[PDB]
From a paper:
A third product complex was generated by co-crystallizing the nucleophile inactive mutant CtGH5E279S-CtCBM6 with a WAX-derived oligosaccharide. The data revealed a pentasaccharide bound to the enzyme, comprising β-1,4-xylotetraose with an Araf linked α-1,3 to the reducing end xylose. The xylotetraose was positioned in subsites −1 to −4 and the Araf in the −2* pocket. In the active site of CtXyl5A the α-d-Xylp, which is in its relaxed 4C1 conformation, makes the following interactions with the enzyme: O1 hydrogen bonds with the Nδ1 of His253 and Oϵ2 of Glu171 (catalytic acid-base) and makes a possible weak polar contact with the OH of Tyr255 and Oγ of Ser279 (mutation of the catalytic nucleophile); O2 hydrogen bonds with Nδ2 of Asn170 and OH of Tyr92. O3 (O1 of the Araf at the −2* subsite) makes a polar contact with Nδ2 of Asn139; the endocyclic oxygen hydrogens bonds with the OH of Tyr255. The Xylp in the active site makes strong parallel apolar interactions with Phe310. A surface representation of the enzyme shows that O3 and O2 of xylose units at subsites −2 to −4 are solvent-exposed and are thus available for decoration. Indeed, these pyranose sugars make very weak apolar interactions with the arabinoxylanase. At −2, Xylp makes planar apolar interactions with the Araf bound to the −2* subsite. Xylp at subsites −2 and −3, respectively, make weak hydrophobic contact with Val318, the −3 Xylp makes planar apolar interactions with Ala137, whereas the xylose at −4 forms parallel apolar contacts with Trp69.
The GH5 arabinoxylanase (CtXyl5A) derived from Clostridium thermocellum displays an absolute requirement for xylans that contain Araf side chains. In this enzyme, the key specificity determinant is the Araf appended to O3 of the Xylp bound in the active site (−1 subsite). The dockerin domain recruits the enzyme into the cellulosome, a multienzyme plant cell wall degrading complex presented on the surface of C. thermocellum.
Numbering used by the authors: 37 to 282, 291 to 363, 372 to 516
Amino acid sequence: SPQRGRPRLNAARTTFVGDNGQPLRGPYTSTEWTAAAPYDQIARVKELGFNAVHLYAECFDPRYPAPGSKAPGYAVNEIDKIVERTRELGLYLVITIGNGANNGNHNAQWARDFWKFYAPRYAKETHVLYEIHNEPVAWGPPYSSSTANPPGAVDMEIDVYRIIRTYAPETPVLLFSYAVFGGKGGAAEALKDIRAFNKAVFGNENAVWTNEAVAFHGYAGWQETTIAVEELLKAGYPCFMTSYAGGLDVELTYELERLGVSWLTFQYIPPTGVSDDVTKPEYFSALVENSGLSWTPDYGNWPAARGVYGNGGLARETAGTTRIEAEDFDWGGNGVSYYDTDSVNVGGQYRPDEGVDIEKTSDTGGGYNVGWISEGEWLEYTIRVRNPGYYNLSLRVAGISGSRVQVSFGNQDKTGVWELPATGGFQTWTTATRQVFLGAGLQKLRINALSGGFNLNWIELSPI
Ligand SMILES: OC[C@@H]1O[C@@H](O[C@@H]2[C@@H](O)[C@@H](O)OC[C@H]2O[C@@H]2OC[C@@H](O[C@@H]3OC[C@@H](O[C@@H]4OC[C@@H](O)[C@H](O)[C@H]4O)[C@H](O)[C@H]3O)[C@H](O)[C@H]2O)[C@H](O)[C@H]1O
Ligand SMILES: O[C@@H]1[C@@H](O)[C@@H](O)OC[C@@H]1O
Ligand SMILES: [Ca+2]
Ligand SMILES: [Ca+2]
Ligand SMILES: [Ca+2]
């Protein structure tokens, strides 16, 4: 069977991982007011490096159970199709209740009845996880405050959890689905909610969860959301991102990858959804490609295996001058993180098992330079620009004759043709500088050798 094995908490207790130990990563679809996305459209997520699908299954009715209100269960035939199609495609599925125009709200009786019907229905589907309710409170913790808008969401979480565990004893549960989860303060407020949940459900405020995690969204922004997640992780509670958007929020994704946290992004499986289509490059694949983000996919060969050389495998951050040694190009290999015309490293130095040609340099500071740079060659360096704006881009270069380079950032040309002066010698060094406008974020710096005949020691960036 291609059916995926039950997700489980990882050893580090940071998130749910799959049957191969890898995080869950995926886009979303909806059966709230539309049919289930076709099989071939769901299949496309496998080629975009994903192994999961977020389903907004049904939208709640605030008026329920008043006359003419829409009851839960209306989409059952469409949800069954999503469950079957994900089963057969070897994908994980996270099912939740959506809100339509009523995000930051819920109807407790509607939620209890929804889960009463659906929990037993998919209990045995080992690829299916249950997320209690999307964004049930405007707009994050503490739900347990008597003045939360609206009140009683923790009672709903408790009640639905018990319903789920009665009929689906082994099914992973994602709790809270906080819209705005930000700062040490946010984590502290979430811990009030968690402690109250745990006391009611486990009889002990400090329960060690075996099959539950905190669902959250990214609307506090990447930095504050990352702080809040790190706090919650330190407190011993796993989490799972279920909805965020920047297109892909590359910055938060990078942080979640570092922290070992699974994620579902708010771009949709075609034909339809309320945001942006995940198969259009401008909303996902190009953002991943341009940034240098990498993970090992469950299916296919994309994204490429690559990353930062040195610096603990983390993106080199700008401030203040930031130096990137030419010899510290990203790992990933020929045609991926660099292109060299011969697979031998002719200089033999520093990285003898990659193709870039590297020699000891006599330049100030010593170390190494890239040499034997031939027309068409290129080198990539994954960096992170905190502050958007104009920077001085400096190349430390040498050459007997003049040469031409062009430098891209996130696959956008920032320099045009850049004529590098002859210095009269391959170890006679000069600094060439050009102003560039850089956008904020994780991005690959690419040196493109338009001609050969120059050596490159290092690259510098500093604000003008
Ligand atoms: O279908 C998914 C939808 O997304 C969920 O909200 C997310 C939230 O989880 C997080 O990721 O932040 C972004 C939120 O997205 C906003 O969601 C609401 C949406 O506007 C509503 O769109 C639906 C409209 O109504 C339906 O239209 C079709 C019709 O046939 C039906 O009867 C209508 O009810 C509604 O009036 C809009 O306010 C924004 O466009 C989007 O950015 C939601 O919980 C889930 O429903
Ligand atoms: O540094 C240079 C190299 O770039 C090449 O062009 O000739 C050999 C020297 O070591
Ligand atoms: Ca070579
Ligand atoms: Ca070369
Ligand atoms: Ca160097």
